Ligand SMILES: *[C@@H]1O[C@H](CO)[C@@H](O[C@@H]2O[C@H](CO)[C@@H](O[C@@H]3O[C@H](CO[C@H]4O[C@H](CO)[C@@H](O)[C@H](O[C@H]5O[C@H](CO)[C@@H](O)[C@H](O)[C@@H]5O[C@H]5O[C@H](CO)[C@@H](O)[C@H](O)[C@@H]5O)[C@@H]4O)[C@@H](O)[C@H](O[C@H]4O[C@H](CO)[C@@H](O)[C@H](O)[C@@H]4O[C@H]4O[C@H](CO)[C@@H](O)[C@H](O)[C@@H]4O)[C@@H]3O)[C@H](O)[C@H]2NC(C)=O)[C@H](O)[C@H]1NC(C)=O
Ligand SMILES: Cc1nnn(Cc2cc(C(F)(F)F)ccc2CCC(=O)N2CCC(Sc3ncc(S(N)(=O)=O)cc3F)CC2)n1
Ligand SMILES: [Ca+2]
Ligand SMILES: [Ca+2]
């Protein structure tokens with residue numbers, strides 16, 4: 140109930156929302172059908188359009204007009220955005236030579252540069268080049284300000300998840316808006332685009348920028364706009380608010396455009412009908428910039444031009460239908476489209492088995508344009524699992540395609556030629572970033588970065604302390620002229636032990652054999668110094684990682700590698716080694732095929748044993764430092780130590796072996812040596828964070844040897860590849876992965892073929908950021924370099940995506 144008898148006389152676009160049954164005059168009132176009777180009349184004036192003309196210049200103030208060309212308009216702060224161009228011979232901002240903004244040039248009374256976030260729906264990254272001739276204002280912003288070639292959205296690449304990730308710095312799994320459509324089993328409620336339930340605050344986790352602002356005494360314009368309010372009115376309102384008294388005027392503002400997304404859905408991302416939408420957005424940017432210039436705010440305000448996601452070509456003919464795989468199709472509900480989420484139609488149906496459903500969707504047609512996944516087997520980079528609103532069954536849909544339940548859904552609901560929501564590494568989903576203003580840099584290209592990092596930068600820009608979030612603060616300091624956050628390395632929590640030789644062979648009863656009873660003084664001096672760390676400068680190039688939780692571990696040195704061996708988990712947390720360009724691959728000899736040797740530095744009671752692996756019919760074992768790459772026949776013995784050993788399913792061994800035997804050498808050739816740090820990961824509760832001992836759900840049969848859920852490797856080299864990895868004077872180059880440790884290769888449809896036809900493809904799917912690996916391990920890499928910490932942070936957030944240019 141709204142008693143709409145009240146008025147918006149002098150309350151138009153009020154910043155503070157008033158509580159029912161008083162009527163509302165804010166920029167959201169329409170959407171809740173709650174505006175006062177006169178709102179349209181007073182607040183949505185359209186008389187005479189949006190631009191001054193020669194004859195209007197110096198006119199008599201007619202309050203009915205949408206914007207004003209009178210002489211008093213500047214002081215009221217309600218002129219048309221072109222008033223000074225037409226009525227005072229000033230130039231449009233786009234026609235002006237751009238000039239470095241070394242410091243904020245603001246009016247007196249401004250306590251900080253304001254921030255204007257100009258967000259655009261479906262603004263695919265490639266529009267910056269491909270639409271440049273029709274977008275001169277945006278193109279000025281881009282070239283004079285700071286820009287990245289693209290910005291990576293979060294998965295799913297939909298609107299609501301991404302706009303709210305921009306607002307909070309949080310992954311959808313953490314903020315809760317996990318799709319445009321959702322069901323919450325705890326609430327027994329649903330969330331839709333249409334309707335009212337999306338206005339309840341229990342859906343919306345984390346702390347968005349405007350609340351972070353308000354709580355620290357920085358005033359915020361309201362970010363949301365009702366869809367009926369034209370774009371021109373939104374700009375004029377922002378400019379009106381900027382004219383307000385110093386004690387009332389907000390410091391942070393948001394504009395939103397529904398274009399180009401709206402048109403892109405109908406006409407495809409590059410349809411000829413798309414040129415006009417891009418023209419109008421650019422015209423809107425020009426209106427804003429011309430307004431800021433009239434108010435002498437154009438060299439004061441920092442403007443962010445940012446998109447939420449891109450757009451792909453998708454038509455009805457390219458729709459896979461679950462009815463061509465599943466017989467039981469009525470007993471399930473599907474969230475459809477560019478991603479698939481399946482749950483049961485009724486929880487009273489006990490016969491619903493998600494296992495048999497996954498199997499029925501697995502490699503069934505030879506060109507199948509989706510892959511099913513238990514949500515916890517989704518690549519860790521998507522961070523799309525740890526929320527009760529994300530269904531256990533998920534379908535990652537191929538770019539260009541759609542998934543529906545039945546054919547009736549497609550022809551009872553061809554209309555669209557574009558869509559989005561796919562995997563966030565897909566080029567067509569990439570979007571834009573431009574920063575322009577005194578606090579941003581001048582004519583600077585920055586590398587691609589993920590949208591989860593902006594929240595921190597927008598806080599920096601406003602002198603705010605960010606709420607806890609998934610950004611890595613300082614990873615984008617290179618966007619800013621000043622105002623930078625100056626971060627410290629986390630303090631190491633657990634210091635390592637450095638065990639020497641403390642145990643005799645005969646104390647070990649592992650059930651392990653090795654064919655190694657093989658016998659000088661100078662060569663025995665030589666092997667001790669390898670076991671005290673003479674080649675550690677070689678294999679540990681960036682310092683040892685720091686352990687940031689309480690645990691008990693040992694550094695173990697060897698000729699070819701160095702490990703941090705966990706006594707609690709009975710394996711390394713990490714193993715570091717360097718393969719130069721010149722290094723050579725040898726085979727595992729016949730005498731050492733099933734050789735596992737006791738490590739005399741580590742007690743029997745903190746070691747694995749071979750008997751457990753024998754008794755476990757499902758589980759075999761592998762090695763973190765690969766025997767294949769031992770530097771000498773003598774050094775190869777070190778690779779068979781029990782402390783280099785880890786549990787591996789035979790299906791995963793195929794992957795691991797190919798990676799170790801072929802790809803590691805390949806990368807060293809292509810990159811001029813590589814440093815490799817490999818290790819296990821335990822995420823049984825799929826929260827993206829290192830598991831404690833008591834969260835481990837599976838052990839090797841009849842033992843305390845915990846089974847990893849994943850295996851990682853960080854592959855580092857010199858960005859200048861003319862210098863070898865071990866002698867790099869400059870910036871580093873990194874690529875990493877988190878492979879799921881799975882007992883079958885059902886994920887790879889071509890896995891019965893040779894490993895050269897599917898393994899590298901699987902690793903690409905599971906590419907990762909070092910920062911991903913850090914959350915999952917509690918480790919901190921790159922502790923000792925000649926590089927700045929900010930540069931290291933940027934490097935830690937890098938993702939190698941394996942997409943073309
Ligand atoms: C991305 O960044 C985010 C943000 O930094 C990271 O998420 C944080 O991770 C922390 C560790 O997991 C987590 O800390 C916990 O806080 C609990 C209190 O949580 C409330 O308060 C915060 C702060 O205001 C608030 O933000 C939370 O909001 C969540 O929940 C509501 C829904 O109820 C949503 O509105 C919102 O979307 C958000 O949901 C998301 O997070 C929750 C977890 O909080 C998930 O469950 C959801 O699926 C969703 O992803 C909350 O309102 C606190 O209760 C926890 O304490 C337990 O664990 C500690 C460990 O120190 C233990 O010592 C205690 O005993 C305690 O256990 C007790 O409860 C247990 C279960 O009921 C039980 O087992 C025990 O026996 C005890 O009874 C914990 O300290 C923090 O909340 C989240 N924050 C957010 C916003 O998600 C995220 O990790 C980052 N991701 C990556 C990959 O880096
Ligand atoms: C979603 C979303 N998350 N954050 N934003 C704001 C936001 C963040 C950023 C940013 F700066 F972050 F880039 C830039 C712009 C915006 C404005 C988006 C906008 O005006 N839209 C039209 C209205 C619809 S839906 C609607 N739904 C819930 C509420 S409520 N309960 O939270 O009040 C109110 C609503 F009207 C959403 C899209 N939209
Ligand atoms: Ca969108
Ligand atoms: Ca975990």
Ligand code: NA
Pocket residue numbers: 752753754755756757758759
């Ligand atoms: Na076995």
Ligand code: NA
Pocket residue numbers: 502884885886887888889890891
């Ligand atoms: Na297979």
Ligand SMILES: [Zn+2]
Pocket residue numbers: 261298400401404559
């Ligand atoms: Zn859309």
